[PDB]
Paper text:
FluPol, composed of the polymerase acidic (PA), polymerase basic 1 (PB1) and polymerase basic 2 (PB2) subunits, transcribes viral genes and replicates the vRNA in the nucleus of infected cells. Replication of avian IAVs in mammalian cells is hindered by species-specific variation in acidic nuclear phosphoprotein 32 (ANP32) proteins, which are essential for viral RNA genome replication. All experiments presented in this study were carried out with H5N1 Tky05 FluPolA with the PB1 K577E and PA Q556R amino acid changes.
The ANP32BLRR domain (amino acids 1–149) makes extensive contacts with the large CTD of PA (PA-C). The PA 550 loop (residues 550–560)38 forms a β-hairpin that inserts between the ANP32BLRR and the resolved N-terminal section of the ANP32BLCAR (residues 150–159), with the hydrophobic residues A553 and V554 contacting the concave face of the ANP32BLRR. PA R551 forms a salt bridge with ANP32B D159, while PA R559 interacts with ANP32B D119 and D146, in addition to π-stacking with F121. PA R556 forms two salt bridges, with ANP32B E154 and D157, confirming its role in strengthening the interaction with ANP32B. Comparison of the ANP32B and RNAP II CTD binding sites suggests that their binding is mutually exclusive. These data suggest that ANP32B can outcompete RNAP II for binding to FluPolA, in a concentration-dependent manner. Altogether, our data suggest that newly synthesised, RNA-free FluPolA binds ANP32B as it enters the cell nucleus, and that this interaction prevents binding to the RNAP II CTD.
Residue numbers in the entry:
A (entry chain D): 1 to 159
B (entry chain C): 41 to 80, 89 to 138, 226 to 248
C (entry chain B): 1 to 31, 35 to 183, 209 to 226, 243 to 632, 655 to 665
D (entry chain A): 202 to 392, 396 to 716
The structure:
């Protein structure tokens, strides 16, 4: 299901501002890039793109308040800095199953001051010694990496 | 053959220890919990603890004299005064060599007595 | 990060953290007839010049390299020169007056006082009766029994020399009878007595012991040799030699060092050459003493190699597997093998007779370790600036096939010339320096038999860690054997005290699990978990309790030599001391027998 | 005094050994008895060709080329059990320790996971019929249910010798031993160069996770008498620091898991020989708050095992739980067959996600030497300690003061262990203590003749580099031969190839 058609299908004719959560799991990305998602979704507080086949996030529009993002199971390899500027108020980001390979690719997220929970399961970056320590010391604002905190204590379920 | 593995396997089973026939009268067949201390003779190791726990006692001090050198070593170690270590560049002393001398350090030790 | 422990050397030198380059702590779990063929083929390839004979006894071709053509390239060569070997030994005696006379004097006192039982103090030895390897005691017993079956009984005198006389007589018998009833010809008995298996027979081992005893005295008298010594004492040699060379005042000479490995050391040492030096050492000596020693080289020069078991075949088409012995390899179609083994078979077929390859020219490993060290030390002696007649001179250490050389010359060209005159002299006596395992560096850093020397600090890593665990005798032995092994390696192998303490823990954690002596404080439940508990309750000085009875472990570095019982005596309960030993027990470097001495 | 005479059959032998110019032992003995040096060595040296020389090739920062690693398909896992992909079903319930029968602990562990789904094959073995790997897991589940149903735990289960378990256990018998005469005339009796394989990323990641701290205490070493000597105090300081920095390392988890598995295999094989016995894969660890625990990595089904000689091999089937999907690094899982066991809900950044739970099934073989070597893995802790102590003692001999405190009680010290895309990373003591332990444990697990032939030959190429870095003007008679000797060991071993790749990095950074 193409994004342009499926966004309309999910909307159920509801206006872009009237939707609080949009789920776009298991789609067919248009040339590996987002298409059909625009800034009209001002109130969108939950966006999901699981198993979308996305390879670039440089087409993402500007959304003011999107506390939850779900990009896991895509083919993103880099260019995360856009998330810092297009989503200044992003809090929970999931990036499991992507092709991130270097800690440097995670440097842009340092700009995001609202980030508190990051997950990188099945990412090759998690194969380095002191992976948790490196990620935390790179993003000091984080408190829940891969679902666990700095003291390896599972996060409460209220998040 | 691997004697260590054989000892493990043999201590796993019951009544591994061989014993004389005197044990018939010396050690009972059971204990408080009713565990076989021996069997017609083969002896379980649990009997060795019984003899040491509650068995024929004695008041002999002849061991300090049959083994004179070993108790002498114990006395010299117990009354020996140690000294500061010295890390440096590369008959009692023969035995305490494992203390006095090392690869790159010397332990100034006097056995006394 | 991507951890990379080899980068540790970027900060610490390589002689400080060299332990990281030794993989294993014990014998690894891995390891035929294909290797023996290659060994004999290489041995005969390194010496294929000038003479082939045919032994009149065994009818086996023999290759005599000694006094052969001089080498003209850098490949290994076994063409030792008899003149050069004798000259080197003569100079060795000249520089150490009375070295050979004294060694012979101290060996005639050991050939007349060596019980035949000394032949049982060894490892697996080939058995000439059963035609397969048996332990030393069993092989010696079988040989003595078969000798007694014939008219050979001098070994009953209880002297090894008399057993040697018996074997010499046995070599003459026209037919030798063995029952377990088959009788072997004269030739067959010689082939079975001059055979080395995959290890020499019981006949040879008698003389080789005497030859090694003579070589041991010479090695001990030689300062340069470092074979007989071991552990800390060897560490006093390396530095010592570096102290002889570097030390000087107002000196323009420069000194270089060579870490050395000898390539194909065993395959180029020739028993005919060892006879040439056992004949020089035993000069002006009683003719009976010279005869006993020469017999070992005489047999070794005519030795024969057994080609293990053989190759195993299998065919998937009809799914069948077979195993052809090595005896039939003489007459077997080459269609079944592959190209490489086919070439090996083609090259080895002429030599073999009776299913064994006649390996005359070379020497198998481990038989003349000490004597082979006298030759290398002789060559190292030839550099003294008195036998060199030139500005350069050298000195060093050697043990079997590993040597360390130091050359002091005014110039770099002087060093390069000093190295050449040692390499060539080594080539003259059949010693071949390995050019693919040696390197040169200024004095102050080198290696010798895994002892690494760096600016006066010698790290000893020749010997692996032992097995710290229950020996398996009984309760009062294991606790006196493991904590004795720890101490012994602390004094001998120089293992640091931190490892000794953690070795004493990985052992007591094994002595406490096999014997179920889990202590009274812990809640470990087992068959023996009941009695121990109450033995804990009715005692005041709980330190007195032996570890065998669930007591505390009181051993540390300081008291690893004291036996457990004598250690804990002063704090044992008299009510417990009495029960502990009580000579009328139903049960009874370990000693101090107590109730915990079962069988 | 005595009369030891050489007579016929020994005089005749003695007359054929001596050099090729004499015809009797007496003649040669007389010749040697009348020998005086006459400058023979000098004449022979003058006659010898000048091509026989040892030319010292200078060793400079430019000479050392990087080692040439092999080429071919990427290597694959060789360990008996999963190292970093292992998944643990834990109990966190003691039974006074030790006494607990392993199978009851396995039952309790399996009871703590709800989510089992019908097993499905994800990664076929590609060299054995993939069915009869699924059926083995189905059968093990069936017998686990049977044990649970019965009131009394048998305390030692014995799998039914069904068809699938027979094929999996390697009961596809090898050709029967026959007589060579019987098969004299047949198609062929060929008695095999090992395949060459290149590096893969996984072996470098597996060593990264073997250097990391866990949250459980895996090694509980016993007591030592009180310390009264200053040397005893220093030794206790070193040992306690190392143990504290190492007890939680994952290398210690590998040590304990291997020890337990090998002990169980050896006991079962020596006890129940005729039938197939189900041996749980269990390891006991104490958590961060002192509470015991019992972890079940998987199951081992032992095969028929009559072992007289050490080298006699027992074939078993190992089935380990895991969460690592096989489709990420398929070339690593070339010997395993992968089943999809269940679905486990784990905490993500956004809510909780259901992730598949896999089982890796492999038909492996092990002899008694590979069991005794494997029950001694606990001696890897006794080797890393000596490595650390040797470094401390060397750097303390360079000085004349105990450097134990300057090593451990100093937050400023940092050794170059690692390499990121920024420069050689440096970690404090404690990542060196756990890094040498990981190296020792991986040497034990991946022991091979290639490793033993690479460590010895690559140590010479290391001391030459050290001599160059100490300005001692190293020189090598034949450096091309040494490189060849090193490279003949790099064939297919995943561990040895990594150690070679580490060597290349050290040479580049050390000499530059």
């Amino acid at each position: 299901m193409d994004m342009k058609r499926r966004i309309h299908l999910e909307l159920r004719n509801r206006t872009p501002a009237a939707v609080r959560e949009l789920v776009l799991d298991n789609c067919k990305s248009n040339d590996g890039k987002i298409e059909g998602l625009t800034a009209e979704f001002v109130n969108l507080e939950f966006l999901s793109l699981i198993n979308v086949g996305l390879i670039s996030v440089s087409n993402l529009p500007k959304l003011p308040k999107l506390k939850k993002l779900e990009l896991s199971e895509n083919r993103i390899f880099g260019g995360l800095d856009m998330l810092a500027e297009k989503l200044p108020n992003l809090t929970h980001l999931n990036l499991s199953g992507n092709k991130l390979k270097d800690i440097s690719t995670l440097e842009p997220l340092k700009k995001l001051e609202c980030l508190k929970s990051l997950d990188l399961f099945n990412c090759e970056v998690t194969n380095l010694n002191d992976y948790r320590e490196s990620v935390f010391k790179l993003l000091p604002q984080l408190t829940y990496l891969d679902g666990y905190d700095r003291e390896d204590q599972e996060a409460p379920d209220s998040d | 053959k691997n004697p260590a593995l054989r000892m493990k396997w043999m201590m796993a089973m019951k009544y591994p220890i061989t014993a004389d026939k005197r044990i018939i009268e010396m050690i009972p067949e059971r204990n408080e919990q009713g565990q076989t201390l021996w069997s017609k003779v083969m002896v379980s190791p649990l009997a060795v603890t019984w003899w040491n726990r509650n068995g024929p006692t004695t008041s002999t001090v002849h061991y300090p004299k049959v083994y004179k050198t070993y108790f002498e070593k114990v006395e010299r170690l117990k009354h020996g005064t140690f000294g500061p270590v010295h890390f440096r560049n590369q008959s009692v002393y023969i035995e305490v060599l494992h203390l006095t001398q090392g690869t790159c350090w010397e332990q100034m030790y006097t056995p006394g007595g | 990060m991507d951890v990379n422990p080899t980068l540790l050397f970027l900060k610490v030198p390589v002689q400080n953290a060299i332990s990281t380059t030794f993989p294993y702590t014990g014998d690894p779990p891995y390891s035929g007839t294909g290797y023996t063929m290659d060994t004999v083929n290489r041995t005969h390839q390194y010496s294929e010049k000038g003479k082939w004979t045919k032994n009149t006894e065994t009818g086996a071709p023999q290759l005599n390299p000694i006094d052969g053509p001089l080498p003209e390239d850098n490949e290994p060569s076994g063409y030792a020169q008899t003149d050069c070997v004798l000259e080197a030994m003569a100079f060795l005696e000249e520089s150490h007056p009375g070295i050979f006379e004294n060694s012979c004097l101290e060996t005639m006192e050991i050939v007349q006082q060596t019980r035949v039982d000394k032949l049982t103090q060894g490892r697996q030895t080939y058995d000439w009766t059963l035609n397969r390897n048996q332990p030393a005691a069993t092989a010696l017993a079988n040989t003595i029994e078969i000798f007694r079956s014939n008219g050979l009984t001098a070994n009953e005198s209880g002297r090894l020399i008399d057993f040697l006389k018996d074997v010499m007589e046995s070599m003459d018998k026209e037919e030798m009878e063995i029952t377990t009833k088959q009788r072997l010809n004269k030739k067959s008995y010689l082939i079975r007595a001059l055979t080395l298996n995959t290890t020499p027979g019981m006949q040879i081992r008698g003389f080789v012991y005497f030859v090694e005893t003579l070589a041991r005295s010479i090695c001990e008298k030689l300062e340069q040799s470092g074979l007989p010594v071991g552990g800390n004492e060897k560490k006093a040699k390396l530095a010592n030699v570096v102290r002889k060379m570097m030390t000087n005042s107002q000196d323009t000479e420069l000194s270089f060092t060579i870490t050395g490995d000898n390539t194909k050391w065993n395959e180029n040492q020739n028993p005919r050459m060892f006879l040439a030096m056992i004949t020089y050492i035993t000069r002006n000596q009683p003719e009976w003493f010279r005869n006993v020693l020469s017999i070992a080289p005489i047999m070794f020069s005519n030795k024969m190699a057994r080609l293990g078991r053989g190759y195993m075949f299998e065919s998937k088409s009809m799914k069948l597997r077979t195993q052809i012995p090595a005896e039939m390899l003489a007459n077997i179609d080459l269609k079944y093998f592959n190209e490489l083994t086919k070439k090996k078979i083609e090259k080895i077929r002429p030599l073999l007779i009776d299913g064994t390859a006649s390996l005359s020219p070379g020497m198998m490993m481990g038989m003349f370790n000490m004597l082979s060290t006298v030759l290398g030390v002789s060559i190292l002696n030839l550099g003294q600036k008195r036998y060199t007649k030139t500005t350069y001179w050298w000195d060093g250490l050697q043990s079997s096939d590993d040597f360390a050389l130091i050359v002091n010359a005014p110039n770099h060209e002087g060093i390069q010339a000093g190295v050449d005159r040692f390499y060539r002299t080594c080539k003259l006596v059949g010693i071949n320096m390995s050019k693919k395992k040696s390197y040169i560096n200024r004095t102050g850093t080198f290696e010798f038999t895994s002892f690494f020397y760096r600016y006066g600090f010698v790290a000893n890593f020749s010997m692996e860690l032992p097995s710290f665990g229950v020996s398996g005798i009984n309760e009062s032995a294991d606790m006196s054997i493991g904590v004795t092994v720890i101490k012994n390696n602390m004094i001998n192998n120089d293992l640091g005290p931190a490892t000794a303490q953690m070795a004493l823990q990985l052992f007591i954690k094994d002595y406490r699990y096999t014997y179920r002596c889990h202590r009274g404080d812990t809640q470990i439940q087992t068959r023996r978990s009941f009695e121990l508990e109450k033995l804990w309750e009715q005692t005041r000085s709980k330190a007195g309790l032996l570890v065998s009875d669930g007591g505390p472990n009181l051993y540390n570095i300081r008291n690893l030599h004291i036996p457990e019982v004598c250690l804990k005596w002063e704090l044992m309960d008299e009510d417990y001391q009495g029960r502990l030993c009580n000579p009328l027990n139903p049960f009874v470097m370990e000693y101090d027998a107590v109730a915990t001495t079962h069988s | 005094e005595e009369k030891f005479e050489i007579t016929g059959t020994m005089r005749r032998l003695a007359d054929q050994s001596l050099p090729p110019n004499f015809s009797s032992l007496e003649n040669f003995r007389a010749y040697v008895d009348g020998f005086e040096p006459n400058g023979c060595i000098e004449g022979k040296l003058s006659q010898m060709s000048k091509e026989v020389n040892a030319r010292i090739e200078p060793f400079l920062k430019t000479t050392p080329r990087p080692l040439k690693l092999p080429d071919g398909p990427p290597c694959s896992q060789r360990s008996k059990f999963l190292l970093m992909d292992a998944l643990k079903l834990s109990i966190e319930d003691p039974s006074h320790e030790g006494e607990g029968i392993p199978l009851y602990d396995a039952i309790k562990c399996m009871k703590t996971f709800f989510g089992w789904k019908e097993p499905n094959i994800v990664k076929p073995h590609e060299k054995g019929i993939n069915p009869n790997y699924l059926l083995t897991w189905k059968q093990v589940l069936a017998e686990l249910q049977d044990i649970e149903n019965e009131e009394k735990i048998p305390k030692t289960k014995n799998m039914k010798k069904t068809s699938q378990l027979r094929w999996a256990l390697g009961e596809n018998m090898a050709p029967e031993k026959v007589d060579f005469e019987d098969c004299k005339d047949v198609s062929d009796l060929k008695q095999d160069e090992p395949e060459s394989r290149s590096l893969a990323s996984w072996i470098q990641s597996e060593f990264n996770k073997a250097c990391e701290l866990t949250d459980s205490s895996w090694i509980e070493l016993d007591e030592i008498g009180e310390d009264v000597a200053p040397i005893e105090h220093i030794a206790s300081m070193r040992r306690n620091y190392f143990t504290a920095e190492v007890s939680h390392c994952r290398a210690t988890e590998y040590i304990m898991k291997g020890v337990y598995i090998n002990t169980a295999l050896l006991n079962a094989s020596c006890a129940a020989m005729d039938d197939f016995q189900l041996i749980p894969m269990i390891s006991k660890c104490r958590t961060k708050e002192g509470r015991r625990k019992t972890n079940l990595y998987g199951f081992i089904i032992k095969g028929r095992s009559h072992l007289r000689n050490d080298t006699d091999v027992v074939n078993f089937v190992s089935m380990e739980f895991s969460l690592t999907d096989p489709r990420l690094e398929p070339h690593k899982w070339e010997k395993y067959c992968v089943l999809e066991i269940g679905n486990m809900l784990l905490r993500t950044a956004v809510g909780r996600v259901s992730r598949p739970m896999f089982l890796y099934v492999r038909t492996n073989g092990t002899s008694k030497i590979k069991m005794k070597w494997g029950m001694e893995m606990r001696r890897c802790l006794l080797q890393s300690l000596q490595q650390i102590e040797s470094m401390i003692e060397a750097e303390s001999s360079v000085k004349e003061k105990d450097m134990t405190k300057e090593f451990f009680e100093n937050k400023s010290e940092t050794w170059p262990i690692g390499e990121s895309p920024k420069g050689v990373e440096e970690g404090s003591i404690g990542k060196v203590c756990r890094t040498l332990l990981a190296k020792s444990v991986f040497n034990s697990l991946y022991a091979s003749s290639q490793l033993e032939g690479f460590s010895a030959e690559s140590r010479k190429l290391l001391l030459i580099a050290q001599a160059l870095r100490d300005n001692l003007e190293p020189g090598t008679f034949d450096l091309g031969g040494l490189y060849e000797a090193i490279e003949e060991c790099l064939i297919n071993d995943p561990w040895v190839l990594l150690n070679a790749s580490w060597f290349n990095s050290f040479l580049a950074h050390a000499l530059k």
